[PDB]
Amino acid sequence: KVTVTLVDDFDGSGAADETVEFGLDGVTYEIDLSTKNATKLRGDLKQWVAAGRRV
Amino acid sequence: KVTVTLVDDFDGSGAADETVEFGLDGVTYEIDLSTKNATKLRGDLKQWVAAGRRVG
């Protein structure tokens, strides 16, 4: 049978739960992640977003 | 005398050497940083940029 799977781009393992959008140096990215991993990515950006300012 | 200086936003006690643009969840951000802290920022996103896909 044909199986279509949404795979977590970061640890390569499982049913990814969400796609997160993010950016650096004017480049925009998208990434498919488990709930756990998207929490991890937002966690890594937390301190820079706080110190930074919205444009 | 008056002094005008770019101060590192992250720790607040240093001359910023550069301004870095980044984004999360549709929102775009700017931050002024020392060369060192700019390296830390880019370092924190490195694994995520690597696994992610560039879009418009």
Numbering used by the authors:
A (entry chain A): 4 to 58
B (entry chain B): 4 to 59
Please give me the paper's original passages concerning this structure.
A second structure generated from crystals in the hexagonal space group P3121 was solved at 2.04 Å resolution. These crystals contained protein truncated at Lys-4 as a result of limited proteolysis using trypsin. We then artificially induced this proteolytic processing by adding low concentrations of trypsin to purified N-Lsr2 before crystallization. This facilitated crystallization in a different space group, P3121. The dimerization and the linear oligomerization of N-Lsr2 is identical in this hexagonal space group when compared to the structure in the P21 crystals. The linear oligomer strands lie side-by-side in the monoclinic (P21) crystals whereas the hexagonal crystals (P3121) are made up of stacked layers of linear strands that are rotated by 120 degrees. This provides further evidence that the tendency to form linear chains of dimers by processing of the N-terminus is intrinsic and not a crystallographic artifact. The hexagonal crystals have a higher solvent content (70.0%) when compared to the monoclinic crystals (38.7%) and there are pores running through the crystal lattice. Intriguingly, these pores are of appropriate dimensions to accommodate long chains of double stranded DNA beneath the N-Lsr2 molecules as well as the Lsr2 C-terminal DNA-binding domains adjacent to the N-Lsr2 molecules.
